[PDB]
Amino acid sequence: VVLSAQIAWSENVETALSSMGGGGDAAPLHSVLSNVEVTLNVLADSVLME
């Protein structure tokens, strides 16, 4: 599970960085960070219960 969460993050961040290198506009890294934060919120809401 941790390996999958790491590989997906590594591929997404590299794709966003390639997009930044090419276009040079805005930041898909913001989208990656937002997705990570949403996943973190879901995880943190799933540990308070049994």
Characterization of this structure:
The protein is an all-alpha fold. Helices cover 80% and strands 0% of the residues. It contains two helices and no strands. The protein has helices at 2-23, 28-45. The longest helix has 22 residues, at 2-23. The chain is elongated.
State the separation between the terminal residues, measured CA to CA. 20 Å
User: Which series of helices and strands comes N to C?
Assistant: HH
Strand content: under 5%
Radius of gyration: 14 Å
Structural class: mainly alpha
| Number of distinct beta strands | 0
Largest sheet: none
Helix content: over 70%
Instruction: Please count the helical segments.
Output: 2
Shape: elongated
List the helices and strands and how they pair.
Blueprint lengths: L1 H22 L4 H18 L5
Helix pairs in contact: 1-2
Describe what is shown at a glance:
It is found in: Cytoplasm, Cytoskeleton. By secondary structure, the chain is mainly alpha-helical.
Characteristic terms for this protein:
1 chains, part of a larger assembly, 50 residues, mainly alpha, Cytoplasmic dynein 1 heavy chain 1, elongated, 0% strand
